[PDB]
Amino acid sequence: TDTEWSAMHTGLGKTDLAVLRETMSMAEIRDLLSSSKKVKDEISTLEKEIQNQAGRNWNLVQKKSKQLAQYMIMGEVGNNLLRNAHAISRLLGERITNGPVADVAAIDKLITLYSLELMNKSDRDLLSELAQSEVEGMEFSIAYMVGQRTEEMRKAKGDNRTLLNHFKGYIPVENQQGVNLIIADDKEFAKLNSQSFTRIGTYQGSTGFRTGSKGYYFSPVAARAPYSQGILQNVRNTAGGVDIGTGFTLGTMVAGRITDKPTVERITKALAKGERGREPLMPIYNSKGQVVAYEQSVDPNMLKHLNQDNHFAKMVGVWRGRQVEEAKAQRFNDILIEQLHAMYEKDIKDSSANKSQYVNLLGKIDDPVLADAINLMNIETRHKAEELFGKDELWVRRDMLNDALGYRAASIGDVWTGNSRWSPSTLDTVKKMFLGAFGNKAYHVVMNAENTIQNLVKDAKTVIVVKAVVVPAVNFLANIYQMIGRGVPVKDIAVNIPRKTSEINQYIKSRLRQIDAEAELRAAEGNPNLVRKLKTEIQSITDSHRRMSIWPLIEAGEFSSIADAGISRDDLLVAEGKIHEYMEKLANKLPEKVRNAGRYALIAKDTALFQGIQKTVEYSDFIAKAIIYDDLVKRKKKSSSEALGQVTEEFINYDRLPGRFRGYMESMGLMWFYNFKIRSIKVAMSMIRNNPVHSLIATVVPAPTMFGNVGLPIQDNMLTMLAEGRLDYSLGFGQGLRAPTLNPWFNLTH
Numbered sequence: 001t002d003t004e005w006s007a008m009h010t011g012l013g014k015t016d017l018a019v020l021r022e023t024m025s026m027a028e029i030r031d032l033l034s035s036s037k038k039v040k041d042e043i044s045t046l047e048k049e050i051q052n053q054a055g056r057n058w059n060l061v062q063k064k065s066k067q068l069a070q071y072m073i074m075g076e077v078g079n080n081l082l083r084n085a086h087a088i089s090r091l092l093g094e095r096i097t098n099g100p101v102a103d104v105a106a107i108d109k110l111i112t113l114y115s116l117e118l119m120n121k122s123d124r125d126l127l128s129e130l131a132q133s134e135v136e137g138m139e140f141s142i143a144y145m146v147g148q149r150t151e152e153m154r155k156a157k158g159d160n161r162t163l164l165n166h167f168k169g170y171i172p173v174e175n176q177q178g179v180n181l182i183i184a185d186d187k188e189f190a191k192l193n194s195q196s197f198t199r200i201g202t203y204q205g206s207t208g209f210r211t212g213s214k215g216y217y218f219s220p221v222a223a224r225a226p227y228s229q230g231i232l233q234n235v236r237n238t239a240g241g242v243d244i245g246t247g248f249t250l251g252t253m254v255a256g257r258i259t260d261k262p263t264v265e266r267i268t269k270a271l272a273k274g275e276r277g278r279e280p281l282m283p284i285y286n287s288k289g290q291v292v293a294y295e296q297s298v299d300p301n302m303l304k305h306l307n308q309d310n311h312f313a314k315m316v317g318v319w320r321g322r323q324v325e326e327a328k329a330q331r332f333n334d335i336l337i338e339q340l341h342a343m344y345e346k347d348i349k350d351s352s353a354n355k356s357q358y359v360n361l362l363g364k365i366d367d368p369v370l371a372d373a374i375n376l377m378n379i380e381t382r383h384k385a386e387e388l389f390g391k392d393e394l395w396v397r398r399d400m401l402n403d404a405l406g407y408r409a410a411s412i413g414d415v416w417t418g419n420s421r422w423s424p425s426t427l428d429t430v431k432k433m434f435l436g437a438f439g440n441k442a443y444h445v446v447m448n449a450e451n452t453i454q455n456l457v458k459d460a461k462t463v464i465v466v467k468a469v470v471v472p473a474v475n476f477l478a479n480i481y482q483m484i485g486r487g488v489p490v491k492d493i494a495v496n497i498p499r500k501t502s503e504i505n506q507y508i509k510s511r512l513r514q515i516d517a518e519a520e521l522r523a524a525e526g527n528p529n530l531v532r533k534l535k536t537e538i539q540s541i542t543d544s545h546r547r548m549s550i551w552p553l554i555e556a557g558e559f560s561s562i563a564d565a566g567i568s569r570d571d572l573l574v575a576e577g578k579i580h581e582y583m584e585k586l587a588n589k590l591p592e593k594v595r596n597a598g599r600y601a602l603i604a605k606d607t608a609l610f611q612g613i614q615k616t617v618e619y620s621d622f623i624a625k626a627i628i629y630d631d632l633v634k635r636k637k638k639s640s641s642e643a644l645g646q647v648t649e650e651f652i653n654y655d656r657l658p659g660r661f662r663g664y665m666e667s668m669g670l671m672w673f674y675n676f677k678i679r680s681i682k683v684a685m686s687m688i689r690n691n692p693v694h695s696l697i698a699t700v701v702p703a704p705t706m707f708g709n710v711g712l713p714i715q716d717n718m719l720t721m722l723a724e725g726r727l728d729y730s731l732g733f734g735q736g737l738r739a740p741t742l743n744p745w746f747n748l749t750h
Contacts, residue, residue, distance in 0.1 A: 166240025403487030447732030
């Protein structure tokens with residue numbers, strides 16, 4: 001029954017029963033579950049033995065082992081929680097101790113025996129009958145948990161920082177498909193005026209940290225954007241429920257994380273007096289026994305709303321299928337190191353003077369923030385690099401390394417804390433660019449810095465126009481962030497987009513007279529006076545085209561694939577910069593019964609407004625390739641044919657991918673989300689070949705749009721509300737300024 005599967009999940013899984021196989025046979029374990037007196041007898045003899053070794057520290061060892069058993073079952077967090085027996089053996093945060101106070105293995109047995117007594121009486125009765133009538137089934141299930149435990153222990157024992165911080169008795173659990181629970185600030189949430197969230201409680205916090213009023217908000221079943229929920233979306237390996245190397249938690253949800261040195265020392269001596277609150281803070285311990293961070297826990301009662309599943313058979317399959325995926329991503333990083341060594345070998349062989357353009361990564365690092373991230377690098381990749389190069393050797397090209405660190409000149413904040421945003425200088429540069437490219441009216445309704453979009457529309461017809469301008473705006477802004485991340489300087493784009501817009505603008509105007517001068521040539525079959533005038537006119541225009549800076553793109557044909565496919569008078573608005581008014585003109589051609597349906601109106605693929613959006617989208621790609629081509633030629637020193645080779649592999653023709661969704665459904669915003677997804681896959685595949693150093697760095701050095709979920713409550717980006725059809729946001733302030741991640745291997749698989 002479904003109740004028996006849940007009892008087995010709590011008994012075998014959450015109590016870490018696999019640790020008993022070190023000293024007891026499989027038949028003896030089945031005897032413990034069938035007799036409560038045996039459990040009480042084992043505790044009595046185990047307590048006496050540990051008391052002799054512990055000595056005067058017996059009171060503290062007993063207290064901390066009982067507190068841990070409370071968390072593993074009922075989820076309660078006490079004061080100064082120690083997550084495993086390795087930390088309890090050293091009594092971190094209680095007394096200064098130079099080693100294990102007692103036997104680590106003995107303490108492990110006592111902790112899991114204590115938590116076995118905390119289980120429900122009805123729950124224990126179910127396990128007793130199964131252990132007697134299903135002998136062959138129960139033994140096989142126990143053996144699976146032994147295999148799951150060894151893999152985690154193999155990764156955890158590699159580093160001492162993650163050895164003292166991994167959770168004991170961790171087993172995955174999944175929420176209900178569709179629901180969402182977040183913790184948000186009260187004042188910031190009020191101004192959004194969202195109509196899908198309900199406040200279900202308040203966040204009290206602890207007395208050691210002072211902050212603004214917070215609360216819990218819950219969202220019932222709905223439809224969410226793809227690749228935003230249901231997966232961990234983490235680019236780092238996890239052992240024991242925490243990140244390998246740092247010790248930060250990723251298998252659960254926390255309200256925040258504090259890592260700054262001056263602030264952490266402020267919390268430390270405030271909790272020495274005492275702690276009070278429903279949500280105490282959990283510390284993170286160093287290798288020497290100090291404290292390096294703090295975390296904000298979550299009330300266990302608020303997790304009941306998520307309707308979590310605890311099916312033992314299903315969650316083991318999720319556990320093993322996730323360990324395999326982590327192993328494959330680990331092996332991929334080893335092959336990249338082999339390629340980096342092969343390139344370094346040839347250059348030195350050709351000439352001994354080529355070593356002047358290489359930097360030792362594992363050696364001394366001058367940059368402090370860069371150096372700290374290097375130390376916490378995964379230990380499995382460190383040994384592989386040392387195997388090929390030598391003792392503390394990792395040489396990479398200096399020019400390729402500078403590109404991978406071009407993000408830090410424009411971003412501020414810390415990724416782990418969760419407050420990494422663009423610098424105010426960067427925003428004032430991007431904001432002025434969108435106003436010039438798009439219409440002035442469009443800027444007022446899209447990037448309003450005080451009000452959301454839904455608060456600025458008060459007519460049923462204006463909803464259709466507003467929902468159409470969003471799609472080109474998202475594509476225009478997404479490309480700017482993506483090219484900024486890849487090392488292109490900010491000041492280059494700021495001075496080149498107006499230059500390229502002007503060059504493109506005069507192209508259609510000049511092409512307009514040439515596109516119909518052939519009609520006059522057909523009517524010029526006669527006296528040479530008509531021919532003489534036409535011949536000079538057409539040749540003069542073409543000579544002007546030859547001198548344009550974007551000419552090489554024109555000859556390739558990709559720059560004029562759709563320019564010559566159709567000429568209309570209203571399309572001059574797009575080239576001028578009146579996109580918002582260009583949408584109104586095509587909106588009035590809709591039927592009266594459709595225009596007045598507002599957000600309920602279904603737009604067909606045959607209408608003129610539908611094809612107007614597609615024309616504008618390819619007009620944004622008009623400028624994207626122009627900037628990239630200059631970058632690969634001016635500051636990269638590449639041939640005019642090499643640059644055009646790379647451009648063709650990062651853009652696709654959208655006429656081959658019509659929507660394939662149901663009728664009677666608003667699939668306008670969902671179709672463009674999937675189209676933009678495929679183009680991101682091609683970009684990631686190109687970055688691997690043309691920049692092996694950047695791909696390896698992206699999973700080592702924290703950076704915005706480089707790491708996925710960090711354990712904090714799920715946050716959206718610009719690409720998320722586009723697919724969901726919402727309007728309670730704006731692309732100019734707060735949320736909505738975030739861009740999707742750029743990790744190459746992450747995008748290929750997720």
